[PDB]
Each structure stands twice: as structure tokens, then as C-alpha cells.
């Protein structure tokens, strides 16, 4: 039931990587500051409750604790996002929330190489400064600065540097990402998940000038042509809000942070995309009757450059490697290693599960010329049908400068698909695939009593990864990225861009999109960091623009080619004339 007369300067939807740090600078500016988030209070500094009865009373919950971050792998109704085939948090904090929590300071080359002018290492540097003093990274979380259960990546990581790899801090030497290995850095802090839900949102919610309405689904943006004049939320659960809430008068605001999936599919329902997927949505028994009509539609490539790391497998097994079982620790945690977390925040329940062993990367100049990035995380599980006690996950991503794209599509149920799968559509990014798993076994090969199982002695790399299907469900590292994608060359024109430098909308004049959704392609590395930095950078262009100024009676305020004011000064409207020209009038 939204408010009678209440209205913000910035209406931010969704509570993740993305709109939480976003909605915490805007706050921070002094303007007024909604954050709309689909689910519920998360960690116990969000007022989450949620949690296994051996956290009762001691102020956690599951979403605070890093040794229980597997549990969304088993356990995640009411927590995951139905309306994608894909994995997503939709709790307060996104994907942050159930994440792994792994946060890297940024690589230079992944922006300089990823994004246009503006958008470039040079620009974003700052930005990486602010989210990198709000969140430093921590490789040692348990907070005696002890590391535990090491045995595995000693194991890999003496192996490493035997095959001429070199240990970095990584977060120290952020841009040696080339035959560098490194111990996991995670945005932990005081032994618990902490991230942008303890740092952004903390600062934020103290604020009077912030406001979160949780259980709140953002349906779509409600707009006259290119102005958006607020947005229609209906309860996602009990206490959500239904209704439809405006932004401050002409000078108002909004910025979807819904994800990479979930912003693309408000764009969608706000006749916002390509015409085949909109005419999905007109033609849909949910939005049909009250969707925007096709002549106020823009079409951009929203869904189009569908981007992930390709995740590929390797498992190795040796003898001094030593499995915990996290999953076991969900209810019925080792009881020491319980107290010592409960009460010294130490121990292996302050890492993440599974125990994430070495850290370590390569960069691989292809055939073509391209040098593609390689990101291995090895993690003490088994992966591939390998037992867990002995074995070694090494997961190979695939990152910047692989070529391959995808597209998401949106369904008559309005839920999103990867209907294009992203993953090797180019053969140069299959050999670098090959040539790092060759790579790393000519690095471990003089390791002792090391077992190959995946792939096993008796195949190749190349049959090894030929072998493999490449789909979403066995080969997705959960890095969605690229469906609303920043640049230059305007959408509406055929070009690849759904946002501008400013992040904004083209074809609006107060419209503007900050997540995953608006990475050209992936980084070298997890994503998270990075989105944060995009947010940090993207608000501050945000905060710089000049107030936006409505057009005079007359004055054209709209059209396909137009750039301007969207919005007509008081006692004139926008009014459509034809697909190039509106008129206040
Ligand atoms: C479990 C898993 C493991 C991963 N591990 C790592 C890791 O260790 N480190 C790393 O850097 N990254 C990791 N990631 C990647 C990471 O989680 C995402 O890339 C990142 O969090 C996405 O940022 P985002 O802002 O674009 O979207 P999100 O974080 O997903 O935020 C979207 C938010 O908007 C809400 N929302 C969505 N639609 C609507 C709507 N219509 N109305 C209102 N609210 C809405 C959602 O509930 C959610 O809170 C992993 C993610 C997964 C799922
Ligand atoms: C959002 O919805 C959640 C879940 O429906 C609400 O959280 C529950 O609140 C009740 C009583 O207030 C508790 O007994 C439950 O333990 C809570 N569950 C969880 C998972 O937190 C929450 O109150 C709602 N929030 C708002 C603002 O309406
Ligand atoms: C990453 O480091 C490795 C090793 O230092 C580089 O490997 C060299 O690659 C060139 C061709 O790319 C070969 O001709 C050399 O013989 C390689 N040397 C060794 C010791 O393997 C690799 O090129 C580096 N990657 C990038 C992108 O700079
Ligand atoms: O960034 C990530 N970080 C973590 C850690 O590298 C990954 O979690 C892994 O995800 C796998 C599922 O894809 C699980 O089988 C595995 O146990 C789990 O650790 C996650 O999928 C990936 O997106």
C-alpha cells in the first residue's frame, strides 16, 4: 500500500552488489534514497533471523556465516530467484548474500581492455580506491589470522611454484594475473560475511534520507515516453509494498539494480528491448492488458551479449589432503570448531565452503592474437563424481577476452532463460580452455603421490574438454554479465549499447541501470569487486550530471534519435507525433 505523498530523488531497485553500494552513495549526496528489494532481511545486521538452531542467541544467521555459504547449493527455497533458469540470490544483499565472498581488486587490463573511454582503468581508479577502503579484501578471515585445514593448498601451491608459478598477495599486486597463484581473499570482516551488506548498507540505513522497502517486486518503470515517472511494485511477500511510487518531480531518478537477469527483464515489461521480446510480453497473460503500448516501445539489445566465465572442472586427489564436510556443519557443526567460532570468530567455519584452497591465474595469447584470461580456484571438494575425501576441485574460468556471447530471453511467464548458451562459440576460446589444463598439469607434474582423476592419465586435454557438454547447468560459473550493455553506440540505432557512459537508459532522460547487467563482457576474475567499483563509479557520474531541465512548450521532447529532456516544462505534455518526433504541447 504505497503512501499517499511520498516520493525520492533516486528510486533504487534491488538490494545486491549493485543497488546496495549505488543507493549508499546517493544517500550519502544527500538526496532522497529509496532501495526497493524483492526479498527479506538477510544477515543479522540486516535484522535477518534466518539460520540453524546452533546460531540461536548468538546474533547470526546463515547468511553471516562463511563455512555455511554451501547451504544454498541444498537448501535454497525462499532464498533463490524463481522467476530465472539461472542461479540468483533474491535476498536483501543479492548475490552477496549467499555468495562464496570471494572479493578481488580489480586487474587494469579488464577494464582498460572491456570497457570504452570513461569507462577505462584510468577513470574507475578511484572508484576501485573508495570500494577497496570500504571493503578490504582479507585472505586470512578467521580473525587470529591462523588459516585452517591448509594441508590442500600447500599440497597445490608448492606444486605451483616448482612449475614456475609465483605466490602473490593477490589484492597487493592486483594486476599480476599471469602464471601467479595466491590464498583466496574474501570480503570477510570480523569472521563474518560482512560485504557490501556490512559496509554500504550499514552506512546507509543509518540515514534519514534512506529508506529500504523489502518483500517488494519491482513489476516495472512507469513512464510518459522517455521520462520515467516512478515505479509499480506489488508485494513479493506479506509487508511488500503495493502500488506505485513516483520520483521527485522532474529531477527524480531511478536505477535498476535488479541483476543481470532481473533488470533486463524490467526493461522488458517497460516496452524496453528488442521488438520480438517485447511482443512476448504484450502478447503475455500477466502484462499483457496493462503494458505500455508499442509505439512508446525503445528498442535496444537488452538480453543480447549474454556473457559468464565458462567454468570447466579439473579434480586432482593426494594423499595430504584433508576434507571437511561443510554441509555437516549446517547441523550438526565439530564442536570445537563451532566454539571457536561462536566464541573467538576463528577456526575453518570462518572460511568458506568448501575450504578454497590456492588461488591462481595465466594469461594465454591465442591463435588469433587475443590474450585470453584464465582464473583456476581450487577448493578441497570433490567435483566431477570424484569422492570428497582425498580430492581437489581446480575449476578453470574463462574470462576477459574470450569472444563467445549468449543471449536471455524472457518467456510468456515473464521469467527470464539463457536461450543462447554464451560458452565457445569461437574456437580460439576452446584452445585456451585446452592449453591452461595442459598448463597446469605440466606445473603439477612434479608434485608426489598427485593423482589425475579429472581428466584421468589416460585422456587428453583436448578429448577431456571435447568430451564435455557446454551448457548452463554443468558449465555456468553463476557471473551473468552483458544483458544491458554500456557504450556508446546507441541501441536504437542497431547499435550494441543499452546504456550510455552514464549509465543511462538511452532513449530516457532519468532512466539508468547499475549491475552486472552493463558489463561489456566478464573480468578476470569473481565479479563482485568489480560491480562494486561500477557502482561506486557510476554513481559518482550520476551525482554530476546537472539537474535535468524540462523542455518549453514547443520544444520537441522526444523521438527515436533524441537525447535530451524527455520531460515538458509545467502546462505543456509530451506528446507523440510520429517515431521521430514528440512535442510539449
Ligand atoms: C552462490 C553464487 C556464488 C558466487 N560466488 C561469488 C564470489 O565468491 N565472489 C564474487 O565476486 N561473486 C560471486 N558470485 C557472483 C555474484 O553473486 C554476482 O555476479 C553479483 O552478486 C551480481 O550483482 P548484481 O548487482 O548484478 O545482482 P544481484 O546481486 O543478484 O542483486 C539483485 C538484487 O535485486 C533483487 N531483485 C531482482 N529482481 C527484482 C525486482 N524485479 N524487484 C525488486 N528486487 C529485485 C534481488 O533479490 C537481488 O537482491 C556468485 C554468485 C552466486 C549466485
Ligand atoms: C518480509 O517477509 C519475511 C518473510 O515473510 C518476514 O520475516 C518474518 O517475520 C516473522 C514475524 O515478523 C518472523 O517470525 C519470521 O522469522 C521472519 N522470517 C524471516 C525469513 O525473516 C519479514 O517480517 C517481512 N519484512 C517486511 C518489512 O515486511
Ligand atoms: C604469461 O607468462 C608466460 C611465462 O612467463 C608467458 O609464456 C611465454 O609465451 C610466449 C608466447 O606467448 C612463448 O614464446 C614463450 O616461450 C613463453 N615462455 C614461457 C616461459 O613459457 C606468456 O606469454 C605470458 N602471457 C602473456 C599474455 O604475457
Ligand atoms: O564465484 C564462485 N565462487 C564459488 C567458489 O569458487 C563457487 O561455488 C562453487 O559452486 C559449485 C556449483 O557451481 C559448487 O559445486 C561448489 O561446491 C562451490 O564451491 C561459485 O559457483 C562461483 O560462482
Excluded at 94 to 111: I, M, Q, R
Excluded at 173 to 197: I, Q, V, Y
Excluded at 371 to 387: C, F, K, M, N, Y
Aim: hydrophobic share 35%; glycine share 12%.
Amino acid at each position: 500500500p504505497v503512501p499517499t505523498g511520498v516520493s525520492f530523488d533516486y528510486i533504487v531497485v534491488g538490494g545486491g552488489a549493485g543497488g546496495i553500494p549505488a543507493a549508499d552513495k546517493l544517500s550519502e549526496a544527500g538526496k532522497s534514497v529509496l532501495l526497493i528489494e524483492k526479498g527479506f532481511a538477510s544477515t543479522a545486521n540486516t535484522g535477518g533471523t534466518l539460520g540453524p538452531e546452533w546460531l540461536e542467541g548468538h546474533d547470526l544467521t546463515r547468511f553471516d556465516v562463511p563455512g555455511l555459504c554451501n547451504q544454498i547449493w541444498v537448501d535454497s527455497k525462499g532464498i533463490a530467484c524463481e522467476d530465472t533458469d539461472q542461479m540468483a540470490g533474491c535476498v536483501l544483499g543479492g548475490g552477496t548474500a549467499v555468495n562464496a565472498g570471494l572479493w578481488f581488486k580489480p586487474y587494469s587490463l579488464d577494464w582498460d581492455y572491456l570497457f570504452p573511454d570513461g569507462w577505462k582503468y584510468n577513470d574507475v581508479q578511484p572508484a576501485i580506491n573508495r570500494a577497496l577502503s570500504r571493503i578490504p579484501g582479507t585472505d586470512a578471515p578467521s580473525t587470529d589470522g591462523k588459516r585452517y585445514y591448509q594441508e590442500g593448498f600447500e599440497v597445490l601451491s608448492k606444486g605451483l611454484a616448482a612449475g614456475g608459478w609465483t605466490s602473490v598477495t593477490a589484492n597487493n599486486a592486483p594486476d599480476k594475473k599471469n602464471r601467479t597463484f595466491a590464498h583466496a581473499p574474501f570480503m570477510f570482516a570480523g569472521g563474518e560475511r560482512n560485504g557490501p551488506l556490512g559496509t554500504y548498507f550499514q552506512t546507509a540505513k543509518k540515514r534519514n534520507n534512506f529508506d529500504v522497502w523489502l518483500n517488494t517486486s519491482v513489476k516495472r518503470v512507469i513512464r510518459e515516453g522517455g521520462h520515467i515517472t516512478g515505479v509499480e511494485v506489488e508485494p513479493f511477500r506479506d509487508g511488500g509494498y503495493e502500488g506505485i511510487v513516483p520520483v521527485t518531480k522532474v529531477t527524480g531518478r531511478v536505477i535498476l539494480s535488479a541483476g543481470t537477469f532481473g533488470s533486463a527483464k524490467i526493461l522488458l515489461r517497460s516496452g524496453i528491448g528488442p521488438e520480438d521480446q517485447l511482443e512476448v510480453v504484450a502478447a503475455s497473460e500477466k502484462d499483457g492488458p496493462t503494458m505500455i503500448g508499442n509505439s512508446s516501445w525503445i528498442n535496444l539489445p537488452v538480453g543480447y551479449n549474454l556473457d559468464d566465465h565458462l567454468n570447466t572442472d579439473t579434480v586432482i586427489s593426494h594423499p595430504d589432503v584433508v576434507f571437511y564436510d561443510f554441509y555437516e556443519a549446517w547441523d550438526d557443526p565439530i564442536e570445537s570448531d563451532k566454539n571457536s567460532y561462536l566464541e573467538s570468530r576463528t577456526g575453518i567455519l570462518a572460511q568458506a565452503a568448501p575450504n578454497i584452497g590456492p588461488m591462481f591465474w595465466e594469461e594465454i595469447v591465442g591463435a588469433d592474437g587475443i590474450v585470453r584470461q584464465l582464473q583456476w580456484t581450487a577448493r578441497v571438494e570433490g567435483s566431477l563424481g570424484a569422492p570428497n575425501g582425498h580430492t581437489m576441485t581446480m575449476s578453470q574460468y574463462l574470462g576477459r577476452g574470450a569472444t563467445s556471447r549468449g543471449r536471455m530471453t524472457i518467456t510468456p511467464s515473464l521469467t527470464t532463460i539463457v536461450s543462447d548458451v554464451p560458452y565457445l562459440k569461437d574456437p580460439n576460446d576452446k584452445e585456451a580452455v585446452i592449453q591452461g589444463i595442459i598448463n597446469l598439469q605440466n606445473a603439477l607434474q612434479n608434485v608426489a603421490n598427485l593423482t589425475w582423476l579429472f581428466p584421468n592419465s589416460t585422456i587428453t586435454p583436448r578429448e577431456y574438454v571435447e568430451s564435455m557438454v557446454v551448457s548452463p547447468s554443468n558449465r555456468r560459473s553463476n557471473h551473468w554479465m552483458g544483458t544491458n550493455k554500456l557504450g556508446t553506440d546507441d541501441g536504437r540505432k542497431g547499435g550494441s549499447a543499452v546504456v550510455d557512459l552514464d549509465t543511462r537508459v538511452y532513449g530516457t532522460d532519468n532512466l539508468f541501470v547499475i549491475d552486472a547487467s552493463i558489463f561489456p563482457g566478464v573480468p578476470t576474475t569473481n565479479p563482485t569487486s568489480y560491480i562494486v567499483v561500477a557502482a561506486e563509479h557510476a554513481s559518482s557520474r550520476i551525482l554530476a550530471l546537472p539537474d535535468l531541465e524540462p523542455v518549453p512548450k514547443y520544444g520537441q521532447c522526444g523521438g527515436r534519435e533524441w537525447t535530451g529532456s524527455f520531460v515538458c516544462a509545467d502546462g505543456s505534455t509530451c506528446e507523440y507525433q510520429n517515431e521521430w518526433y514528440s512535442q510539449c504541447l
